[PDB]
């Protein structure tokens, strides 16, 4: 059933699974019209489909042309997400297909279940974890490829860079979710932390800076401080 703190280590076992997050599929700017009414303008979005064991990220870019002439776009976005995830699964060799797909929002359950009827043995699961994957568009290289897209496109990344050479997937996921939680709570501060020291660079083939083990401990501490701070600045404590 639902994925929660009690069954957290299941994410790092050897059953292939994918998280699917749809919070950046349908994105808009809200603006005034010449007549003083309000209107929306869509911008490019993305499906965030992530293997938490390996770090493999299947970033399906959603070009604004998919919304042209369509009604009820927030509803359509969930079904478009499920269509694209189903298409991804069918494109993978059988031995690479997931045994479970975990959706970060319960409104994705029925759309994905219906699109995956051909795969009765793939479990579609919700989660009680409040995962910060909406902040994926605060990762500069991901935001860049989404905004530059002129057509539908899939781009493959490893969201852990080379971390798995040195740490376990449990630890890599915890670092990732800490980084993304920070970026979600105070993007400016989080990005300052990550890039304050000009001698640490991001490799061309990476998403995050090339921190040593000791520097990651400092970085991770600074992100916890930020999250706690903002939690005070917010609630005043």
């Amino acid at each position: 059933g639902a994925m929660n703190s009690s069954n957290y280590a299941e994410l790092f076992n050897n059953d292939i699974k994918l998280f699917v997050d749809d919070t950046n599929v349908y994105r808009v700017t809200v603006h005034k019209t010449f007549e003083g009414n309000v209107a929306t303008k869509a911008i490019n979005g993305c499906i965030f489909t992530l293997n938490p064991k390996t770090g493999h990220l299947f970033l399906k870019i959603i070009h604004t042309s998919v919304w042209a002439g369509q009604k009820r776009l927030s509803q359509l976005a969930k079904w478009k997400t499920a269509e694209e995830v189903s298409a991804l699964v069918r494109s993978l060799p059988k031995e690479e297909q997931p045994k479970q797909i975990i959706v970060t929002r319960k409104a994705m359950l029925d759309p994905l279940e219906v699109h995956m009827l051909d795969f009765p043995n793939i479990a579609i699961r919700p989660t009680e974890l409040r995962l910060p994957f909406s902040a994926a568009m605060s990762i500069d290289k991901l935001s860049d490829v989404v905004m530059k897209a002129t057509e539908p496109q899939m781009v493959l990344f490893n969201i852990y860079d080379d971390w798995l050479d040195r740490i376990s997937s449990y630890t890599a996921f915890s670092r990732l979710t800490l980084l993304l939680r920070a970026l979600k709570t105070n993007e400016e501060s989080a990005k300052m932390i990550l890039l304050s020291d000009p001698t640490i660079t991001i490799k061309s083939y990476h998403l995050w800076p090339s921190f040593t083990d000791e520097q990651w401990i400092t970085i991770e501490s600074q992100m916890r401080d930020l999250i706690l701070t903002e939690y005070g600045r917010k609630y005043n404590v």
Binding site: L76, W79, E83, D110, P111, E113, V114, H115, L117, D118
Partner: protein
């Protein structure tokens, strides 16, 4: 007018005949039910005084044979049987009537309730849902499960209602996933009506039979079936106008007849609120919506 003779009444029992019911005492000189209207299916049903567990009963049509009830002390229930000797039967009934040992089917002349509840119900379709080919009548009880319930365990004792499942390949055309899930018209009209039921009369007949088994026996799988068949119509944007008008009448009389004190268990809040207030047909069931709001405003 036809008659169903009882050999005797050896155990105290509440007996139903259609929407009516009466109490019979242990070894009371009760010999059956007379003046049963020809032209309709009927149901004769039982609840023992000592074990209200297992309501059970028999669907029958007196045009199909001469039927009587006799208690079996080994299996512990009132059984329906067919008497093939027509002269023995007429002689049994005439004696019982002369001795005034029978209750009269107590139909008020103004009253169309039973017709309205069984308009599309046919014995031949009942006998395909309830499979026991050697009898002309059909046994149902509170515990019998449906074919769909069994897929989610004795197949011979099952209610073979038509399986309806909104998240199934039968319901959802490849490439029309969102369309078919949010508007079930293709599943209603092509798959079920044209394909399986053949016409709306057979669909309504199964819907009405499922409701009656839910009401008279508290049969939970029948209640599930009744609500699924309502929801499939209400969740379709394209439904023939005559079907909507007829559904409104069907449900009106069902809600009218329901015991007020059983609405908690026999009515699914989600289905009824969705059907009356959210669905494509939210504005198409005026009679049903009006009686529901005046009789069960809590559910909504």
């Amino acid at each position: 007018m036809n008659t169903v003779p009882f050999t005797s009444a050896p155990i105290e029992v509440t007996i139903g005949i259609d929407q009516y019911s009466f109490n019979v005492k242990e070894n009371q000189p009760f010999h059956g039910i007379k003046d049963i209207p020809i032209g309709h299916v009927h149901v004769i049903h039982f609840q023992h005084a000592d074990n209200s567990s297992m309501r059970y009963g028999y669907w029958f049509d007196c045009r199909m044979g001469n039927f009587y009830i006799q208690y079996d002390p080994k299996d512990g229930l009132y059984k329906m049987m067919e008497e093939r000797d027509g002269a023995k039967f007429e002689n049994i009934v005439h004696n019982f009537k002369e001795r005034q040992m029978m209750v009269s089917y107590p139909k008020i002349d103004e009253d169309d309730t039973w017709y309205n509840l069984t308009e599309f119900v046919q014995m031949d379709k009942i006998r395909k849902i309830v499979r026991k080919d050697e009898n002309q009548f059909s046994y149902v009880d509170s515990s019998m499960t449906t074919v769909q319930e069994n897929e989610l365990s004795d197949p011979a004792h099952s209610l073979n209602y038509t399986v309806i499942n909104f998240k199934s390949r039968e319901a959802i055309r490849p490439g029309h996933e969102m369309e078919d899930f949010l508007d079930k018209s293709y599943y209603l009209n092509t798959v079920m009506l044209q394909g399986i039921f053949k016409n709306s009369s057979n669909y309504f007949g199964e819907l009405q039979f499922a409701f009656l088994n839910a009401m008279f026996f508290g049969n939970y799988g029948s209640s599930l079936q009744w609500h699924a068949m309502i929801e499939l119509i209400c969740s379709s944007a394209t439904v023939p106008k005559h079907m909507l008008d007829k559904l409104d009448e069907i449900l009106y009389y069902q809600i009218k007849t329901l015991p007020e004190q059983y609405s908690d268990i026999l009515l699914n809040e989600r289905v009824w609120n969705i059907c009356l207030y959210s669905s494509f047909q939210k504005n198409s069931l005026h009679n049903t919506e009006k009686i529901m709001e005046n009789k069960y405003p809590e559910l909504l």
